[PDB]
Write a protein that binds this ligand. Sequence first.
Ligand code: V25
Length: 334
Amino acid sequence: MHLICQSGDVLSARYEIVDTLGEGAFGKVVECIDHKAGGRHVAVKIVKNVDRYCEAARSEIQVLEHLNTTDPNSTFRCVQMLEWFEHHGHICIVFELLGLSTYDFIKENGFLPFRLDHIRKMAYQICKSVNFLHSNKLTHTDLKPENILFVQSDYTEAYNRDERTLINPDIKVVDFGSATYDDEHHSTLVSTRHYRAPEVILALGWSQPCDVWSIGCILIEYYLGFTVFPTHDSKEHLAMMERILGPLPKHMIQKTRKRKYFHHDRLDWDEHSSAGRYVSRACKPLKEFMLSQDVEHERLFDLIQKMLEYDPAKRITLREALKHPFFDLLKKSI
Ligand SMILES: CCOC(=O)c1c(/C(C#N)=C\N)c2ccc(Cl)c(Cl)c2n1C
């Protein structure tokens, strides 16, 4: 990877690297000048020459070919792939250039949260975009702030501490290397995720509702500046869920084969261990995280609580979420 992604490198006799935009498990994304398209700047995803990542890259190309044909005007804000190629045996995917991920923006803003009016706009676009995937028999599976990118991340600064505020909070959804079609094999074992929906943890089967769970988690991270599930251990994750959302439904405990998380009818969790003391400190009931009691904060948290419904059947769908009162302020002027 290190050998093929330096600035000044030319890819496919066409794309001149000018900058590195980010790095992930898959490899790296660089910014390039497209010399065969009039010097337009593009993003190029350079994928590790590793079997699992190559496989995911080929899968992402097929998804993106389908999405871009289905939505040629980009009306639903999925990232637009321009083409793909191979470079020294590495799969390279060319994208329209986008701005900073929402995760990177929060980080460069000192972990300050987004203003509520920007959260509302961003949440609406994310719901509309992922609902478009759900309408086409797809599940994203890896929604997280790092995979939501601002179209353009220019900002202004002002004293409140010092805050950056987006000039335009338009976003797109990216990273389709994990997206899965309904009729495709769904991994009952799911790798590392920033957010773990409970049906994924408990191996009860998953589909489009696990995206809604992730979006609820995204929204509370936008509101707080940090995740309410600061963990990568699955049992700790379930312990955090119980503290924030209440006990897991007995019908899900009854059905799961993940008996390693359980003892009798309840989570097998030692509240006085190192992890236990941390969970007790770091987590609390969802609505205690509210920073205001104003009605538009209540509206946001009502939506978040519906998205964080344990049972994925009962959980709100994105089509329903787009009709939630939190979004009424975006509706047509009377
Ligand atoms: C985890 C690092 O991913 C990125 O840095 C990233 C990513 C990915 C991927 N795949 C995930 N954040 C991008 C996808 C499309 C476009 Cl246009 C851009 Cl510019 C992307 N960037 C900068």
